């Protein structure tokens, strides 16, 4: 079970819309998905299991600093079948990677939607996102399918064992 | 003002994506918005306040049958500024109104996003959503802006007394 795995105050899971973040959240089975509107046009989905807070919002296109406080892990979910917006995904990851309040957080990239036939594999996304130029920060890419749960654990197993080194 | 209204079962708030339904749910302030995924591709936002259940999903499955059994009012949210998709919203409301398990549920229409300059007012939304063709059912349209809550009270007050 996934509750025993995380046996990190905030895990920020972001990415473009329709990447599957809400589905991954529901697949964790760690509590209800609560959605709040802190400010207008800013939707946030949260799952508080005990002490761990999974914060989710879509990116694309300064109150985020508050969430970046005590964010020990970043999960960047990607639609591996969305070749039209993979460049936009890299630029959004590069944006948050260059946030000084977030450089301490470990990064987990999810090459989601591997079930689709023309989806890019985990290593093509590795290159498209430019992950191999990351330095002074542990990162890990995991091939996942959120609607099934494939790879969701082994990815988050790396995350939980990475924050608690 | 909102929480006072529904103090005295199932309310179905449907509409196209980006219509403002999540925004309205947060304005009710009757409880936390809970997102659930009963089946793949079906996202449902729910706000429960003791007796009442505010169910929200996007339109545009035979599973809807079982949400309908005690659905007393349906709130159809439509973005008054989205002129390209207004006909699609008309089709999805017609599919909802032809449903037999919701035949006795009153209809509240919310012409949302009136704050935008090129947004269709409640008059032509009424004309193009086809509310005057509606018989066998009391319906009501209200011009709203869920961002500021403009109009939500007057529309939910009508819903309050029809199902009060
Ligand atoms: N084929 C496939 N579809 C997925 C997967 N994960 C999510 N989806 C679909 O992507 C759509 C959007 O999912 P959602 O979790 O709401 O994306 P979000 O915007 O990041 O929250 C849904 O209709 C899901 O069915 C996956 O692993 N494979
Ligand atoms: N201008 C304006 N924007 C709105 C209004 N209501 C919602 N929005 C915007 O529409 C976007 C999506 O709204 P949402 O409630 O999530 O739509 P939903 O798909 O029905 O849940 C949000 O980013 C809001 O900023 C409104 O009355 N006026």
UniProtKB/Swiss-Prot annotation, chain A:
SMART domains, sorted: ARF, RAB, SAR
Binding site for GTP: 15-22, 58-61, 112-115
CDD domains found in the cross-reference section: Arf1_5_like
Molecular function terms, GO-annotated: GTP binding; GTPase activity
Location in the cell: Golgi apparatus
Record-linked InterPro entries: Arf1-5-like, P-loop_NTPase, Small_GTP-bd, Small_GTPase_ARF, Small_GTPase_ARF/SAR
SUPFAM superfamilies listed in its UniProt record: P-loop containing nucleoside triphosphate hydrolases
Short name of any one Pfam family annotated for the protein: Arf
Major site of localization recorded for this protein: Golgi
Protein name listed in UniProt: ADP-ribosylation factor
Naturally occurring in which organism (per UniProt): Candida albicans (strain SC5314 / ATCC MYA-2876)
């Amino acid at each position: 079970l996934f509750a025993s795995l995380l046996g990190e105050m905030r895990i920020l899971m972001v990415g473009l819309d329709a990447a599957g973040k809400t589905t991954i959240l529901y697949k964790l089975k760690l509590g209800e998905i609560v959605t709040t509107i802190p400010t207008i046009g800013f939707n946030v989905e949260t799952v508080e299991y005990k002490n761990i807070s999974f914060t989710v919002w879509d990116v694309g296109g300064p109150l985020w600093r508050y969430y970046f406080q005590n964010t020990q892990g970043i999960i960047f979910v990607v639609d591996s079948n969305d070749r039209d917006r993979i460049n936009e995904a890299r630029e959004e990851l590069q944006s948050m990677l260059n946030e000084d309040e977030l450089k301490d957080a470990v990064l987990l990239v999810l090459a989601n939607k591997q079930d689709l036939p023309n989806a890019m594999n985990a290593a093509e996304i590795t290159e498209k996102m430019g992950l191999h130029s990351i330095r002074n920060r542990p990162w890990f890419i995991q091939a996942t399918c959120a609607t099934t749960g494939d790879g969701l654990y082994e990815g988050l197993e790396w995350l939980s064992n990475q924050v608690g080194k």
